[PDB]
Amino acid sequence: ADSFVIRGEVRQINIDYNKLPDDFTGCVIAWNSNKLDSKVS
């Protein structure tokens, strides 16, 4: 289980900027960071 936050790049995982493509075998569990890891923005 990896732990990263991207911009939105949500169509892909720009991100050659640190190689984890769609045909890599796995599941994507994802949600918005604007409710917990945020501010006004």
Next chain:
Amino acid sequence: ASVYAWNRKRISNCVADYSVLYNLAPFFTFKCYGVSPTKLNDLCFTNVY
């Protein structure tokens, strides 16, 4: 332009650099088909609209 009166635009002879474009504020997305975002820097085109 408006949707019904959209302006026609053709791009002429150009040495294109796309790596400076994808991080500009109006050019964040590339949700489409038929071209690749990591391959446009190596392709040649007859014209671009």
